[PDB]
Each structure stands twice: as structure tokens, then as C-alpha cells.
Amino acid sequence: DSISPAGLLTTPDLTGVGNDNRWNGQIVGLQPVPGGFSTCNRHWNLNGSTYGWSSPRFADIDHRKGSASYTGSNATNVLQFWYANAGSAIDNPISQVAPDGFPDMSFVPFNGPGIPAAGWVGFGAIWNSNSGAPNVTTVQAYELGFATGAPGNLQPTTNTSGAQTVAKSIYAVVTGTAQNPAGLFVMASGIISTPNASAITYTPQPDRIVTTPGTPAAAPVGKNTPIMFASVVRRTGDVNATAGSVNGTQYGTGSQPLPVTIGLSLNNYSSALMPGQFFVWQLTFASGFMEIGLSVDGYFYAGTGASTTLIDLTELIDVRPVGPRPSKSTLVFNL
Amino acid sequence: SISPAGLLTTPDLTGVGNDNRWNGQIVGLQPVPGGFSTCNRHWNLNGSTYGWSSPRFADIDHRKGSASYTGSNATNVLQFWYANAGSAIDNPISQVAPDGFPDMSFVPFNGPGIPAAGWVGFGAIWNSNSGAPNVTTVQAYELGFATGAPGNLQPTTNTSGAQTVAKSIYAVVTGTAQNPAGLFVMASGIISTPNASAITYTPQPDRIVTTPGTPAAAPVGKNTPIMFASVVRRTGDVNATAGSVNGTQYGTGSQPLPVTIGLSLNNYSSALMPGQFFVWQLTFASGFMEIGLSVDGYFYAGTGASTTLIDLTELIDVRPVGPRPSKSTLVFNL
């Protein structure tokens, strides 16, 4: 009579069809996080709910009532700034914390000419709050993230309470605009900012992830360690680079495969799994196999202990359900 | 044989499924009495696409096009780029065009007015040798298929002899003229409109670009091919959504992307014979209708000559019926 969780994760989700829930990139690796991490945005639990502010999809990021500004007395070829307060996203029915799709990363301040490291970047524009019309001189790539102190003392924050949702173009716009209210419109699939062509570490690192009050953390349980799902994500320093680039492979991480997030958002799985258990799947390769476990908070784990080495899924054969297990029982790692 | 029944389920048409052209949330079914064709990001029941795109929305990239702009003043110019169809040597699916390049004929424009019914995406020109984006060229670009580039652009819907072209709809900081030059554009597009008002559903059938071998969806008796409609952003009013005072803008695709993905992962060639549709029943708050899927991957409704969009807001459930003759009229009680 109870719903089964076994179909939440299936072979295509990790062999090329499944995309991650932060970057919408094709999942190709598992990144262990021995230090633990938290994530709420676009992350669902087994009770049908999210602590975040985003639906399980990638469309656009829009807010009608922020403050657009720029520095100096000449609007030509400036960096465009925009911000609103967290809690002001009144048109988002999920949560007013931030616009649906706004990235859960702390802002990396920059004034140029260098490009910030490890920023979430999306393409978009400022727009006219009354008419909807885009300000055509403001289209650019913008870093988006959470901060305090805008506009004058911008500092990263990872707590949504009292934060500001900020945007700043990483390159000059044709003509900046200074207007409050003004709208922001940015496409919801992002790229990673880098200072030059070289790839950087997997992005976001745990200490950049923004969460709302009450978001549960993923902590190690014995030798079981939480994992993120890694995809190869485009970067600003070399937009051609993909897997295997001579300039380095850039990984972006998410807490869940989006198909899992979607399944959790469609049905309540509370009956499927007791708190303190994991539901376990086996990932089989030619050389061996490994188990990953899903907790009631929606986080995945592997039996990798202190390791931070990315697990490559290029040679993954299939995913098979194993069943529910105590979270303390060590997940097999036989690669 | 594996059954087609699981290809189309309730979430695919009640909010989770996005269309295979715009990646928008499907909220309507648009009948096309005259029939239409689509190959890009469209799969059939024999595991085949005739298009050039994988069943996902990532980015559009080509390393070896020609960037240019009109005149000898690079400041605040409209940026142009093209390459030939057939030159997408790094796309394993097909070298016709880069993966994700939209299957729409280009709408020419000189500015400053914005073209009607163009596919628009955000991106930039980039350096073919280093990979570095040309940061003065970031903009919204209209992409589509044409001939005659760069100086005499003619829309085309035939990939044979075509060019894949891009032109910024608004001025860039500084244009570039280089060959080779790369194009990088994000794959989820928006619709260009001349002003705030919504236009007709986009693309209309006569704008859809196809390759050799692509089959057409023709009406079978009173059964008419449909597209799947989503509310897609438009350049003239980026805040408009469903119900806007400025009109609701629909973008259409030939399939729900969950269907495309299912057809790409398993072969359904024994599950259905030419001449048959696989039928599901769509139950609404008030009434119901049948939808049929043909072996060529096109969907149908029993709506005859009607052009009126079917609103899915009150759709409750999708339930499989099974294979039925395509000549039997699909029920429509809405």
C-alpha cells in the first residue's frame, strides 16, 4: 500500500540524461563532501517539501522591484548593479525569500577590471517596472548572489535572513541605468565565472551555499559522507572548454539529480523511509560497484569516509535499487 | 514489446513537462489543421531523430563562423555571425547545425525595430583560438536559418544549402569582424516581438526548418496534428506571463520533452503499427478528449478544422487507452 522510493533514481539519471539541480548540467560525477554541507534551493525532501525558493525547473529569474545603480558620473560602459532585499519576492508563490531560480550562492564582490572567481553568472537585463520593456543598453552577463551591505559595503552572506539578492554585470554594458524601482530578468541556467581560462575547483564549495532558516544540514554518519552531483559547466574564462579541456575541466555541483527533485515534489514519500534510514541504490561498473543512500532530508551519501576525490560516472553501467538500510551501516565502496 | 503507455503521463501536461523547442511549461495544445513538420529535438517510435539536437537544453556553440557588422563604426553596432549548414563538424548527432541551434527560418531586420517572431537567445562572439569570449559582444541574438549571408539575407526552411545565422537584436558595446570567430548562445530562447503585445503562436508551421528525410504530420480524417504550447517570454515585455494585459505569448513544440527523452531511450517500433495511433484519454474538470501518437512521433487531436488553442489549466489526468486505428476520430468533448 505504501509508495516505493526505488524509482526515484534510475540509470538515465546518472548516465547522461539526468541534470543537476543547481546548474542544469549533465551529471557525470559524484563529489564527496566529508565536511558536510547544506542545500535548500531546488532541493526537496521525502515529505514533499522544500526549504528553498525555487520550483524544480530552470526557466528565468525575475524581480520587478529592485534598485539599479552604477558607480560614477558617466553611464557609458559601466558595470550595471542591481539589488533587492531577500524577503521581497512577493510574486513567488513558493517563498518570498528570493525570485524563483535565484542562485543559492554567496556573492563574490568585484569592481573590475578582473572577473570574479566562482560566481554564478547568467545573461539578462534590467527592465522597466511599469511597462516590462527591457532596457536594451543593459544586456550583459551578470553575477548573481546573496550579500549584505549593498550598495556601498557589499559582503557575502550564506544566510537568507536579512540578506540582499544582488546582481552585477561582469563586463561593461552599453549604458548603465540608475532607477528604483527597476526590474531584473536573467535566464536561470548559469555559468561559472573564472578570472582566466583555467578551471577552478568544483563550484559552489560548501561555504558558499546560501540556505534559509531551518534548512537541515547533511552531516557524515560514520563512514558515510554526503555527496553532490557534478556536471561539466561552462565558464567565462574559456567558453569553449568542456570535459578534458587543456585549460582544465570545470565542475558545477548540485545536491540532487533534478529528476529526483521532481519525483520528490510530486508525491509524499514519508511512508517509504523512516528517519535514520537511507534508501540505497547500487551503481555498477565493470571493475566493481558502489552504493549510494538517500536520507529523508533528500541528501545523498556514499561510503567514502574522508575522501574528496571525484567519482567519474563515464563508465557507470546501471543503477539498481537495493533497499532501505540503517544510515549507520557503511555503504559499500568496491571500485 | 514495451508499451508506449508510460511515454505520456499526467505530470507531462499538468505542469512538469516542458516543450521540446522552447523548454517552456506546457499549458496548451495547439491544433494545426494544415499539418506541419518538425525534426529538431523530435524523436520517432523507432529511436530516430532527423534533426541535429540532443533531447536537452544546454548551449549552442560553433567555433568556426564569420563575425561581421555593417559599416566601419564598431561602436554600438548590431553584431552578425554566420556559418554554413553542414559545417557543425563537432556535433556528433549531425553536422547540419550546432546542437540546440533553433529550427526556425531567420527573420531579417536592420534595426532599430525588433523583428517579429524570431528565436532569441543570449550569448556572445568568442575567440576561436583561445576560447575567450569577446566581452563587448554580449547581447540578445536572433538565430535562424537563411541564405545570402552576410549582405542579402533570405529566410529558408530547407537545411540543404542553408546558413546558420545570428544577429544581435540590440546594439553591442563594440562589434567584431573576424573569421574564424565563435558563437556561444544559451539554448533556451525567448520570442522577439516588435513591442509589448503578444503575437501569434511561434513558430508558425511555415517557419519550421527541416532536413532531408523528415516526415510530415498530415491530418487523418478529422484527426489533426497538434503542437504543445507553453507561455514563453517575449522581448517586448519580459514580465508578461499567462493572462497579461498585453496578451499571452505562446511558443510551440512538437513534443513534450519527457516524451522525446523516452523515445530516445527505448525503441517502440513493435509497439505500434503504421496506421495506428497510441491513444490516451485526457480528463478535465469539465469534459475529456483523446490524444493520439503516431509512429513518426507526432501527436493528434480530433478537432478537425479548428485552430483554437486547448487550455490545459483544468486538465486532471492522463490515462492510456491503447493502439487504435488512426482513421477513427479521436473523441473531443470539451
Side-chain angles (χ1 to χ4, degrees):
Chain A
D1 254 331
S2 164
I3 203 180
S4 173
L8 282 169
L9 182 75
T10 60
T11 298
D13 296 335
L14 297 180
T15 54
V17 168
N19 298 315
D20 77 278
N21 70 339
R22 180 170 288 117
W23 301 95
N24 208 24
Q26 177 179 68
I27 291 165
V28 296
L30 307 179
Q31 174 60 64
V33 192
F37 70 99
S38 297
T39 292
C40 59
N41 196 44
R42 212 176 289 101
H43 178 107
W44 254 252
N45 65 22
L46 273 69
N47 302 329
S49 65
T50 187
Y51 286 74
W53 54 85
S54 299
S55 51
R57 62 201 264 253
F58 289 89
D60 52 58
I61 300 162
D62 74 272
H63 193 308
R64 193 169 164 241
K65 300 292 209 71
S67 177
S69 64
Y70 58 88
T71 288
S73 62
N74 177 12
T76 293
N77 298 340
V78 298
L79 306 180
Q80 179 69 60
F81 190 68
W82 178 97
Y83 80 104
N85 290 329
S88 69
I90 70 177
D91 320 311
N92 180 350
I94 296 174
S95 169
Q96 291 194 189
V97 166
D100 191 346
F102 197 93
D104 64 349
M105 286 170 52
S106 66
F107 196 69
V108 181
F110 67 97
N111 293 327
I115 308 309
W120 187 102
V121 167
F123 296 90
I126 311 301
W127 56 271
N128 184 278
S129 303
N130 283 347
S131 72
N135 186 332
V136 308
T137 70
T138 70
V139 178
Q140 249 306 343
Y142 285 78
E143 189 202 343
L144 273 56
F146 285 76
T148 61
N153 179 31
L154 250 196
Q155 299 298 336
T157 185
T158 56
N159 191 337
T160 55
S161 297
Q164 298 157 323
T165 56
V166 311
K168 193 175 182 167
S169 70
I170 61 172
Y171 315 127
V173 299
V174 165
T175 310
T177 185
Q179 159 75 42
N180 178 6
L184 181 67
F185 177 84
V186 171
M187 319 283 299
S189 300
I191 65 176
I192 293 164
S193 66
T194 61
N196 59 40
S198 294
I200 61 172
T201 55
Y202 80 78
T203 301
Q205 291 287 303
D207 65 9
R208 292 284 307 295
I209 304 170
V210 178
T211 56
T212 56
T215 295
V221 183
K223 309 167 172 103
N224 296 328
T225 285
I227 62 175
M228 302 211 209
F229 294 84
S231 52
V232 176
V233 171
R234 297 285 187 178
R235 64 177 177 269
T236 62
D238 174 355
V239 298
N240 181 55
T242 57
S245 167
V246 286
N247 292 325
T249 302
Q250 182 64 57
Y251 297 101
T253 46
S255 68
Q256 298 178 323
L258 192 69
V260 176
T261 314
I262 290 172
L264 292 172
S265 77
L266 286 173
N267 286 102
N268 192 308
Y269 285 84
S270 58
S271 66
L273 195 70
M274 304 284 329
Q277 295 187 309
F278 288 156
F279 192 88
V280 178
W281 290 265
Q282 181 171 319
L283 276 50
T284 317
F285 307 77
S287 51
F289 63 95
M290 76 162 281
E291 288 172 337
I292 65 176
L294 174 62
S295 77
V296 296
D297 290 327
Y299 292 108
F300 285 88
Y301 287 74
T304 47
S307 179
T308 57
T309 297
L310 185 74
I311 298 158
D312 176 11
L313 298 172
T314 297
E315 290 179 322
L316 179 60
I317 302 167
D318 68 18
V319 170
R320 299 163 54 164
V322 185
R325 197 174 297 186
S327 65
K328 205 62 217 326
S329 300
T330 292
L331 294 162
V332 173
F333 185 90
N334 232 296
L335 296 190
Chain B
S1 64
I2 172 176
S3 170
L7 282 169
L8 184 73
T9 57
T10 300
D12 295 334
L13 300 180
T14 57
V16 168
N18 301 311
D19 77 275
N20 68 340
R21 180 173 286 114
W22 302 99
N23 209 21
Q25 175 180 65
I26 295 165
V27 297
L29 308 175
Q30 175 63 61
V32 190
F36 71 95
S37 303
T38 293
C39 61
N40 195 43
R41 210 175 291 102
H42 180 103
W43 258 251
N44 69 13
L45 271 68
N46 190 34
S48 295
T49 187
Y50 291 91
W52 54 86
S53 303
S54 52
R56 34 178 286 224
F57 291 89
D59 50 57
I60 301 162
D61 63 290
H62 191 309
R63 193 169 182 161
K64 297 256 188 253
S66 179
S68 63
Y69 53 87
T70 295
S72 56
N73 187 346
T75 294
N76 300 339
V77 75
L78 302 182
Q79 178 70 57
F80 185 74
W81 178 96
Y82 82 105
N84 289 330
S87 75
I89 189 171
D90 290 336
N91 179 353
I93 295 166
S94 167
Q95 301 184 348
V96 165
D99 192 345
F101 195 95
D103 62 350
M104 314 173 25
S105 60
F106 189 69
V107 184
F109 62 101
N110 300 310
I114 304 311
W119 186 101
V120 168
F122 292 92
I125 312 297
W126 55 273
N127 185 294
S128 304
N129 299 313
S130 67
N134 185 331
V135 309
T136 69
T137 71
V138 176
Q139 252 302 348
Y141 285 78
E142 187 202 345
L143 273 58
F145 285 77
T147 56
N152 183 33
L153 291 164
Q154 308 294 323
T156 190
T157 60
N158 194 322
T159 54
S160 292
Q163 296 164 324
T164 55
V165 311
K167 186 172 178 168
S168 72
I169 60 169
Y170 316 126
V172 297
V173 163
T174 311
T176 189
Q178 306 294 167
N179 182 4
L183 179 71
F184 175 86
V185 174
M186 283 320 268
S188 297
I190 66 178
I191 292 164
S192 76
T193 60
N195 67 13
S197 292
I199 63 180
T200 55
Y201 76 82
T202 303
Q204 293 285 304
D206 68 5
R207 294 280 310 291
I208 302 169
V209 174
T210 60
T211 58
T214 299
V220 184
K222 288 158 73 193
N223 294 327
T224 288
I226 56 173
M227 325 208 189
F228 294 86
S230 64
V231 178
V232 173
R233 299 288 190 181
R234 59 179 177 269
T235 58
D237 176 351
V238 294
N239 192 46
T241 57
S244 173
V245 58
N246 295 328
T248 297
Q249 181 68 56
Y250 295 104
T252 43
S254 65
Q255 292 177 329
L257 195 64
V259 178
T260 313
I261 288 166
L263 293 169
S264 78
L265 283 174
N266 291 103
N267 187 295
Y268 292 87
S269 60
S270 77
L272 197 70
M273 314 183 237
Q276 288 184 310
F277 287 155
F278 195 89
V279 179
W280 295 259
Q281 186 171 186
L282 270 45
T283 294
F284 291 66
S286 272
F288 57 96
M289 73 180 272
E290 287 170 331
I291 189 183
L293 171 63
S294 77
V295 300
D296 289 331
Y298 294 108
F299 288 85
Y300 284 76
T303 47
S306 179
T307 59
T308 302
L309 184 100
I310 302 161
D311 180 8
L312 302 174
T313 296
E314 290 190 351
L315 176 64
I316 296 175
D317 178 72
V318 169
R319 181 176 291 271
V321 171
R324 301 293 186 266
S326 63
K327 267 142 154 183
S328 295
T329 299
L330 296 157
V331 176
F332 186 82
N333 192 14
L334 289 173

